[PDB]
């Protein structure tokens, strides 16, 4: 879809293997903010969004946190935090035709900069001048959308680039999308290096007397320390006790 | 003027409208250091210097604090702090002649 109507797909309940992404050399830009691409396999994400669109090449740099420009100001804005990745690859052969490709559109005019992850598909006639439009395109009344005009011969800057922005949510909340990272049998009374659904620590995992509610998945005591966790397979509760340390 | 003899004008004792910067379409690089581009309409400056020159496009990068190259080293050097804005636009149609 065009950059103004960028297409969002909600990825959930899958085993996502990101290795194919960074291994492939087709992608031109693979810039990840907040996460390292090589470590994308080990992580588990609360939810994943895939926002795909077609942009001009020189505007690919505008898809980043804290960046300004026509695409960022009026078409697609990325939050400053943005724990995610941006993957853009050139698609001149696919998205350019003989004559011109005018299917793709971008928003020249908007009254105010759009909020992060906001979509504006309204085609209302923008009012640049003082005189109200009342819906007619005139001297200072313009259609807010402009065609890119993709042609087979264009500079690298002007050639179309397909962009996919993967927005991850990383938190202690239950995780749906996880990397493969196999699995391993559970052990109770021994200081180990547990990796329950992304959480990482060192401690013995005793049986828990704590009464979890069905939606509860992990326990925190006073001072906010993760002292209980529900494993994602057995649906059982385990109390975490860090194994002994003491002066000598 | 040429970059080596860059032409400097003092702007003072006047009210400044920066809309010409936002309205114009020519400006390719609009990079501000120490100030924000959108907030120049709400700031008061003790004295302004508007230096101007003509450079080659590949050298536009060298007009910035802490940069090295022929233009920065020998023609026009910007201070490291440099609270100010650099505005550069292509002028191929006007500054190029037959021959």
């Amino acid at each position, epitope marked *: 879809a065009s950059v103004y109507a960028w297409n969002r797909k909600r990825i959930s309940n899958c085993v996502a293997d990101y290795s194919v992404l960074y291994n492939s050399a087709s992608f031109s830009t693979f810039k990840c903010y907040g996460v390292s691409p090589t470590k994308l396999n080990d992580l588990c994400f609360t939810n994943v969004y895939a926002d795909s669109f077609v942009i001009r090449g020189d505007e690919v740099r505008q898809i980043a946190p804290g960046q300004t420009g*026509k695409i960022a100001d009026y078409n697609y804005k990325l939050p400053d935090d943005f724990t995610g990745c941006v993957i853009a690859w050139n698609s001149n052969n696919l998205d350019s035709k003989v*004559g*011109g490709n*005018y299917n793709y559109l971008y928003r*020249l*005019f908007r009254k105010s900069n759009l909020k992060p992850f906001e979509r504006d598909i309204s085609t209302e*006639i923008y009012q*640049a001048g003082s005189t109200p439009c*009342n*819906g*007619v*395109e*005139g*001297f200072n009344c*313009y*259609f807010p959308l*402009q*065609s890119y*005009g993709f*042609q*087979p*011969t264009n500079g690298v800057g002007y050639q179309p680039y397909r962009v996919v922005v993967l927005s991850f949510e990383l938190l202690h909340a239950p995780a749906t999308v996880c990397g493969p990272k196999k699995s391993t049998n559970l052990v109770k009374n021994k200081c180990v290096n547990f990796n329950f659904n992304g959480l990482t620590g060192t401690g013995v995992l005793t049986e828990s007397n704590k009464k979890f509610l069905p939606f509860q998945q992990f326990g925190r005591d006073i001072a906010d320390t993760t002292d209980a966790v529900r494993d994602p397979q057995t649906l059982e509760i385990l109390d975490i006790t860090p194994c002994s340390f003491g002066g000598v | 003027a040429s970059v080596y003899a860059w032409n400097r004008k003092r702007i003072s004792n006047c009210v400044a409208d920066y809309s010409v910067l*936002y*309205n*114009s*379409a*020519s400006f390719s690089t609009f990079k501000c250091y120490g100030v924000s581009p959108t907030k120049l309409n709400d700031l008061c400056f003790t004295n302004v210097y508007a230096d101007s020159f003509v450079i080659r496009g590949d050298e536009v990068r060298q007009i910035a604090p802490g940069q090295t190259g022929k233009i920065a080293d020998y023609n026009y050097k910007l201070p490291d702090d440099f609270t100010g804005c650099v505005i550069a*636009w*292509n*002028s191929n*149609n*006007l500054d190029s002649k037959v021959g």
Partner: antibody
Amino acid sequence: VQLQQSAAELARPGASVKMSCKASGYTFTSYTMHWVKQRPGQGLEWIGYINPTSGYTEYNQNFKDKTTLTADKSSSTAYMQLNSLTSEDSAVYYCAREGHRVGPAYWGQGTLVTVSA
Amino acid sequence: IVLTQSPASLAVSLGQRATISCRASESVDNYGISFMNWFQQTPGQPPKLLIYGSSNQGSGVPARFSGSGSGTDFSLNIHPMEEDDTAMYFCQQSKEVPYTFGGGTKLEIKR
């Protein structure tokens, strides 16, 4: 987007001529309509533009007095009335629809107004 | 705005670049975009839009026609000029209400 006009009108000096531009292929209610003058073998002069939704006409300074513009959304037709025709007004007048942020964008054939006694 | 259209009578052979230049008395750019537009008129036909904006191409416009420029100066170039390009080319500004057309350039094939 096709526009059709009247054809080859001739009028004696001092007369008035009404030309009709018939719109097609669009709403005709959301696009302003411009009228442009072209002397034979010369440049183009923009006469003036009209808004069909609200009859707000804006004319060029030279052509404010001797020209008037009307619109009829009932038949989807724009009209020009030229008044006080003289020799200098003999020309091919053009009717255009506004588009792509251009005043005159989609032009239609052309109506020749010949002022001669 | 007064648009001055340099060379208004160009003779270029087939496959040769043709450059028509339009300069303006005042700035034509506004709201971050450019408003000067290039029209083509073949004899016996109404003018048709080639280039809306400084560089964007009109509907059904071949890649030969390229518009460029900004500020107060713009140019139209036809590098692989074809026999079907013999026409009149106008430059027109949309920045201010009185739309002004240039003098017009008559393009002819050279021999």
